Amino acid sequence: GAMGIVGVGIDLVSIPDFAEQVDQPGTVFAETFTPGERRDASDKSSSAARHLAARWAAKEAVIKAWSGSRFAIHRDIEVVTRPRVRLTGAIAEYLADVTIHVSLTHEGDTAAAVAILEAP
Amino acid sequence: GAMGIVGVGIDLVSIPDFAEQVDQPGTVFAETFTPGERRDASDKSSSAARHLAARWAAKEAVIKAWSGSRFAIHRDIEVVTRPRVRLTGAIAEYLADVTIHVSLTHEGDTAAAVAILEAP
Amino acid sequence: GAMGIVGVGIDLVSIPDFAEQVDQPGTVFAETFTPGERRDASDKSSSAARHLAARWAAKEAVIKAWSGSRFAIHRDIEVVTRPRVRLTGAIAEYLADVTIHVSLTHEGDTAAAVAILEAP
Structure with a gap:
């Protein structure tokens, strides 16, 4: 239907740098991935590191698409795999009527994603 | 005019990995690029490898933008260079009324592209 | 509101290659960044190189989003940091009624950006 773009976001992730940093206590990583997921991903040459980086x-x-948007709580946004976005608590309510398009990719050393927020 | 986004897609391509893999018989590569194009591109430091990777x-x-879309035959989608999309057979008909925006880029070791599908 | 996409653009920038090339007299770089900015950024491991590359x-x-668009002067487009677009002279007038969405990112060796042009 008739829609307007509300926000845009792009992100690049060095997988080797991700593997080094991911397994750290008390970090946003720790609030986002389980201890087991983070240990696994700690091995930069693993498939687990590849996917976690893309997520x-x-x-x-x-987050970039939203932060630059008219809406202004990171444990309220979850990404599941195709990439799906699941929201909880506060933000869920903010974007109840906003359509979220996300696409991700990984190649060798690098993961990348783009997100576009849309609303009538 | 008044439009809604139908699908989004991003893709990253290691050019050196592309050059190694591209020249393989019976692959999707073989259905997409001519034997000559694929041999040329087999040289990772070439300009031919650079462009074929971006294509x-x-x-x-x-493909990502479409596969994640309400439409659900890879030799039916062709990309020509600015990037142009030409469709044939089945998919041509599916997306007869869908507008396709694509942009590509290459830098050193890496090629990248984004695609956005749009419809009233 | 009701909007249509007018153009799309993606760009990747090797930061080390950027640092080598940026400080060159009489180039588009010289028309875009101050001598001081360009000398600073000449050091590839600097934070200044990181940000200038993303800009x-x-x-x-x-530029890609526009060049592929129905509008057809690079010192008329300026990017300031979130990423903001400021236009001058000719192009300012061309896109007076066009909405510009841009997002940028940097990771290690690489900077990247995507731009989407939109209009009723």
Whole structure:
């Protein structure tokens, strides 16, 4: 239907840098991934590191699209795999009527994502 | 005019990895690029490898935008260079009334593309 | 409101390659960044190189979105940091009624940006 763009976001993630940083106590990483997921992903050459990085890139792209938007709580945004966005608590309510498009990708050393927010 | 977004896609392509893989018989590569194009591109430091990778990234971004869309045959989608999309057979008909925006880029080791599908 | 997409652009920038090239007299770089900014950014491991590259990637993404558009003077487009677009002279007038969405990112060796042009 008739829609307007509300926000845009792009994010790049070095997978090797991600693997080094992900397993740290008390971080936003720790609030986002389980201890087991983070240990696994701690091995930069793993498939687990590859995917977790892409999920993190997507979440970041979505945050950028929103933060630059007229809506202004990171544990309220979850990205599941195609990439799906699930929202909770406060933000869920903010964007109840906003359509979220996200796409992710990974190649060798790098993961990337783009997010576009849309509303009538 | 008044439009809604139908799908989004992003894709990253390691050019060196592309050059190694592209020249393989019986692959989707073989259905997409001519034997000559694929041999040329087999040299990772070439300009031919650079461009073929960007064309492949674009095609992939477009596929992602569509696959995640309400439309659900890869030799029916062709990308020509600015990036242009030409469709044939089945998919041509599916997206007869869908507007396709694609953009590509290459820098050193990496090619990238984004695609956005749009419809009233 | 009801909007249609007018153009799309993506751009990738090797930061090390940027640092080598940026400080060159009489170039588009020289028309875009001050001598001081360009000398600073000449050090590839600097934070100044990181940000200038991201600004350059954004400007390029915006140029791509426009060049592929029905509007057809690079010192008329400026990108300021979130990324903001400021236009002058000719192009300012062209896009007076066009909405510009831009997003940028940097990770290690690479900067990236995407731009989307929109109009009723």
